[PDB]
Amino acid sequence: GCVEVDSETEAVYGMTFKILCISCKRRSETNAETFTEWTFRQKGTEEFVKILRYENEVLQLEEDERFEGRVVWNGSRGTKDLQDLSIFITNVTYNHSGDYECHVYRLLFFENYEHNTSVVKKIHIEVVDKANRDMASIVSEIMMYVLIVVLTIWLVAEMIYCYKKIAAATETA
Amino acid sequence: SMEVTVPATLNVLNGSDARLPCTFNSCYTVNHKQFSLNWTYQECNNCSEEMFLQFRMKIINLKLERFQDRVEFSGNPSKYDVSVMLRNVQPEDEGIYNCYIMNPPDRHRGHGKIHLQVLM
Amino acid sequence: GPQSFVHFTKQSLALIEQRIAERKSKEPKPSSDLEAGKQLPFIYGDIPPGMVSEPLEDLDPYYADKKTFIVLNKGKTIFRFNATPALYMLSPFSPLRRISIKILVHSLFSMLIMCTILTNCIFMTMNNPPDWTKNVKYTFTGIYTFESLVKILARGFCVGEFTFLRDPWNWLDFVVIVFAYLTEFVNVSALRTFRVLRALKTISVIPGLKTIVGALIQSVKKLSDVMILTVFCLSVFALIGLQLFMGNLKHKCFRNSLENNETLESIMNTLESEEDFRKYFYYLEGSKDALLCGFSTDSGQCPEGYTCVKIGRNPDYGYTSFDTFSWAFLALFRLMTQDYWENLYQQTLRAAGKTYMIFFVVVIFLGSFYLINLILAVVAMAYEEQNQANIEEAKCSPYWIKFKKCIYFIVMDPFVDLAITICIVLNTLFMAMEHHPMTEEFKNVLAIRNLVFTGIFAAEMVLKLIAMDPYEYFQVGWNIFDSLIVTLSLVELFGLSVLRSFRLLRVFKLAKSWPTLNMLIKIIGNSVGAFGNLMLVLFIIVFIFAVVGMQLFGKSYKECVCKINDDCTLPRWHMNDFFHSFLIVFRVLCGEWIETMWDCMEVAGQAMCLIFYMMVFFIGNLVVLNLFLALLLSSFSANNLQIAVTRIKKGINYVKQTLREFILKAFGKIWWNIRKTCYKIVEHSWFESFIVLMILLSSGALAFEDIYIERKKTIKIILEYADKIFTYIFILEMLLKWIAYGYKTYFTNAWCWLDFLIVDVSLVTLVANTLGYSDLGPIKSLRTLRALRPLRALSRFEGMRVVVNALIGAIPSIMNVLLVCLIFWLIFSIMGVNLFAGKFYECINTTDGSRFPASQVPNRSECFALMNVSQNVRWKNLKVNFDNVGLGYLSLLQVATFKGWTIIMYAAVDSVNVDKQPKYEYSLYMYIYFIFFIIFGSFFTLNLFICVIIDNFNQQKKKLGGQDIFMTEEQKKYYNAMKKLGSKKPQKPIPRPGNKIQGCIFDLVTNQAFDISIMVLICLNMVTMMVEKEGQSQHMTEVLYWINVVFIILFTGECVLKLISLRHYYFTVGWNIFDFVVVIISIVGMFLADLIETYFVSPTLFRVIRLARIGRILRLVKGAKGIRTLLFALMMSLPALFNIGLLLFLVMFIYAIFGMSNFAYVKKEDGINDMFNFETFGNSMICLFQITTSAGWDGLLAPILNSKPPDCDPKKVHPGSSVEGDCGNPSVGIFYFVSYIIISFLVVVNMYIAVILENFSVATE
């Protein structure tokens, strides 16, 4: 079912990049109505400017030239109960670097009870010129080969040590 | 039929106080709002049902002028006894007294019949 | 000599009286033969025609002196009476007494009485009897009273040794008569209860039943120690559960936003109705209780806007709780008997946290299984010994001539009888071809075949009937079966169709060619006698219990229906009618008593239901159902096919030879030294060890891949590379092993084959991935087979290996039974299809799942018309139905494991026809099908499996030489020593210390009274711990604390007293060391817990620490010999149980990995919810533990079964997950669950039983 998973934090200049914002309901069977406001402050700047608002299957964009014609929706389609609120940047620009707030406003419908839930997510991204492999991948790859070579050494080293013993035994017999 | 226990006859000495026992063993618990008890009286055997005691979460007395103020309730219905008490019995009080029970949630409607006779 | 019979005339009375007087002035066992009731010995031969049925003189000498008179019936039955006149009114000469004896002994008397009893029973089963029924009651009472008077005539009224009142059956009849008289002149349910009882004693007297009754009585008398052990164990477990889960089942979800000035207290003071509570607490749709919740992170969660709180009532009317000790004991009895234990498990975990599965785990295995099987053990041994002792003590015309001759001549059993059975197979194959959406043409085709086939079989019957004289015909015990069926068929042709599936049973004649199947068949046959008598007593018992329940709780069930049902309509299981009562008692014997009892208690009240149900349950399940298995276990403790084969050898060989004749008429020292090198290596313990560790690590890697793997990214990467390393390691191992051992040796070992194959799949997958050949359907499928990597671990450990061998050694023998069982189930399934195919469809309102009134939607056309004008309507069909002989088998499995059966039974008993809307109990009496099927399936078949497997184990053992087949080499030495313990002789007496004081202290501690006192104090400490309840005041809590402090001080006191006198000798006794340990533990506990409550903040740990106090209570087992013996038996069985447990864990681990891969992301319905799913490893294993005991397996299966809309959606987003859709695979799901429950049965259930049986014996011996 729903699994809250974190966005990556590094886009490639000139390419496409997806911002993940996932907020599961505590109880899956509950009934809700959700909508979103995304605010963004550029790096080296201190104020959060809203960029878009998504409600009832319609995406509203603000006028900011940083995002006109280059953000689209990848959230939950045709539901009015979102649980997945993501943004696709087409043609990433160095301008998109900075901090993003994924404000979620949720209205849960209960037996004779309605709750106004609000939750906020923080995503800090930085635009680079080239995608670079994660520390883990590289380290895991070098540690993989060493284990092979170490073991393989331990085997063959063991093999001759005992082969000489076998030769000695044969000679004595 | 509901488990209603009433004495079909009761004889009382004129001028004295009489208690008219209506007791039920309806299995379901008594909810004050659901529970209804209505008390009537007949001058002659087949006369009009002269209601004198309603129940609306509390004791509602019609306060009859044939029964000026000698009538009060004599029980605690949540202990399933709904009897009625008459002070200073007199010979027009001779006649039929009837207790009718309703026990929601229980569907069945109960009936009690007591003929009070007055001594001299 | 023979004619020793002589009439008792006053003169022989006077000669007996004179002799007694002589004996008095002066101031021996009798012929068991001539015993009353027993037949006259043929030594006396025939009776003079005038002496029969007459007061005759006493034969037996023992009594010849005392005063008596014997009478014999025309069946030579000896009846002894008292010569003394009853109340000195009439004498042994008075004609009236003679008449009495005569009429009493005639066969008429007893036939009349039992007739009477049977018709009285039919009148008791009457929920609503008419007015003539009072007349018939009068009749009955009068007859019985008259019989009683007759009995009191012959024997007298409490006069001498032989009198009416002296026999207790007569006392019962007299008591019954008095109660009946009393009720009429001036209680009634009780009085009628007393009436029915007559059947019990009056019908157990018939031949055959008496032996079974004796075995039943002996079982109850021998179960004493076992029951005490059960009580003790259950009590301790309840004390543990009460500590851990007191008040936890009152956790609920309460609104955080409230109307102003509404505190929880005010809210509670006002709320009364269900709807009122839904408004303030959180309830799931279709739930009478609120959602349980918890305060931890493994516990159940609460919606947003609702917070958890301990307030309100416990679930299931207030009856499921660990708040007091009584309630806890009920829950523990439920867990021992496994009755809805799944519900308890689940609720408990939702409120306490999933980390308490350990507590449930322990109880189910070490508790439930061990106690249930120990009960079986004692009953089995009882039956066996009874049977043993029983065996021991026992030790025109010419035209007919022409016709008959010809017909016999032309039939040849050699061939004609065999082709017939082949055709029977054909025809049952054709009966399996019937389904629900069949075309009209297909119907007609199968119908024509039915005609043909019965015609074939009937021509045969008539032919044989003519050939062999109709007399000798009927004589055969197979010919009469055949005739019956053919007759039925032709009748029907000219509800019976379902009885032609029995012709199949004729195939067991040809089993007399497969030796083993033949032997199995014979064992069964031998058994059927007592099988039947047992069935009779069971039916009598159920009948009587059903009548009693209807008499006591029926009126209550009618009058208080609204309490147990929102619609105020009698629930599907009630007791206001005889039939429904029978059914509830039957359900208890199958083992489901807690739901019905809840309802009973809610209407009748708690005390009456507890006792009824308890008694009912005890006798039926614990005793009678165990006699089924005991009988079958004791049972285990011509061929014309070959004639035809010889004919075939003649033919195929001869004809081919003639055809051939016609055709002829027409026409490396170094390398060897290297093998030894790598042999050394692959055997060194270090290599072994390394490889075991690798196998272990590879398995944890499998477990790490959950639906949350993508949150954890580092781990994901690590694991890919790790899998690459592991494959290298294992391939290197394979190659070394091919150079050490050799291809030959290698591929002959089976463990090696397994390993080869796993390595091979992994190599394939690696190639694919590294070659870019991945992302294909086989490649993904192969990725799921990684879950068999866990198997390598199996080969390394010896215990798992021993268990697996035993099972492999039985496979040969399980198969035969499987063939016999499969045939029986096929019959039943074809029948089912015929009766219930297509009739399980309804028109529900999907908004709330409610079969429409059926006055508003009669058929299907109308369901569909409603779907046109409105939505949320569906012509839904049950998932597990009887629509084809395949789904039939699954339905049946559910009915026979008693999990999922109710859903099916209901729809059956509601069936109208094919396209018509089911109606409430239209076909109420369809339960009979299930009764009969239920019976066979769960009682004979499964017990047959158990018997066969256990017999196989005993044979495996015997061939080795009595060596345990479930224990390893080292574990066997330990077994030998532990057994030595139970047979250790008393050790030397401890020398008395010589300092006056110590001499005195010694004298005190060595007296038996000292220890009796200590025992009574332990018993009182148990009571102190049982009075603790949820909601006790601070006053009570304080008082109980100081009592426990005093108990601690006293036990420490007896310990130091012992240490003074015994000195070092104190630690040379194992029990004394246990006591020391407990003493220290107790003090430590007190102190530490006092600290946690004040200094620290850990309520959870407070509880877990205070579990120590129960150690003082465990010191009770020393005093009770009966309890400690069984515990010693359990201790010996522990090593064997360990290996089985390890095997179970491996299999469970593999299954969990498979589930995580396939059953994750399915629609959360039925058994699959938010806390019991297959999404993580943990959640997975919990579910699988449940199912190990075949509990709730059906619920988990239903979500998996639906693979199409509108049941499931293929495109479900699964945000945060690459996978799309919530659909599940039906083929995969059935196999995944069925296989597990079978494996479980063959491992945990059958192995546990064997071990217990083996060691119980050992311990008692």
Ligand SMILES: CC(C)CCC[C@@H](C)[C@H]1CC[C@H]2[C@@H]3CC=C4C[C@@H](OC(=O)CCC(=O)O)CC[C@]4(C)[C@H]3CC[C@]12C
């Ligand atoms: C006793 C043991 C050896 C079991 C073997 C019994 C066979 C004789 C029966 C059992 C399962 C039966 C099959 C189960 C279901 C299939 C498919 C079934 O077709 C449907 O289910 C139609 C469904 C639709 O129309 O949508 C028709 C009968 C048939 C061939 C059955 C043919 C006879 C089988 C093999």
Ligand SMILES: CC(C)CCC[C@@H](C)[C@H]1CC[C@H]2[C@@H]3CC=C4C[C@@H](OC(=O)CCC(=O)O)CC[C@]4(C)[C@H]3CC[C@]12C
């Ligand atoms: C991969 C698939 C498609 C084909 C191979 C499947 C394996 C499970 C088969 C192939 C060869 C089989 C083996 C062939 C021969 C034998 C000997 C046979 O047992 C004996 O000969 C008894 C020896 C003794 O008396 O101890 C049964 C087991 C075994 C190892 C078999 C076990 C199962 C094996 C490994």
Ligand SMILES: CC(C)CCC[C@@H](C)[C@H]1CC[C@H]2[C@@H]3CC=C4C[C@@H](OC(=O)CCC(=O)O)CC[C@]4(C)[C@H]3CC[C@]12C
């Ligand atoms: C090895 C087993 C199958 C032996 C015992 C079989 C009986 C339990 C079967 C044989 C024929 C069955 C009957 C055949 C026909 C019907 C109609 C059928 O549909 C109805 O309308 C039932 C009406 C009702 O009984 O209330 C279900 C009940 C009944 C009496 C069946 C009840 C169960 C019966 C007696």
Ligand SMILES: CC(C)CCC[C@@H](C)[C@H]1CC[C@H]2[C@@H]3CC=C4C[C@@H](O)CC[C@]4(C)[C@H]3CC[C@]12C
């Ligand atoms: C209560 C219901 C189930 C009726 C039970 C009656 C039937 C099932 C029982 C009662 C007595 C039993 C019979 C008593 C003993 C024998 C003799 C044996 O050589 C063959 C089986 C046979 C003939 C039994 C068959 C089954 C049987 C007839």
Ligand SMILES: *[C@@H]1O[C@H](CO)[C@@H](O)[C@H](O)[C@H]1NC(C)=O
């Ligand atoms: C009063 O009681 C009578 C009983 O005869 C009943 O018919 C009537 O409806 C009752 N009135 C109310 C308001 O309950």
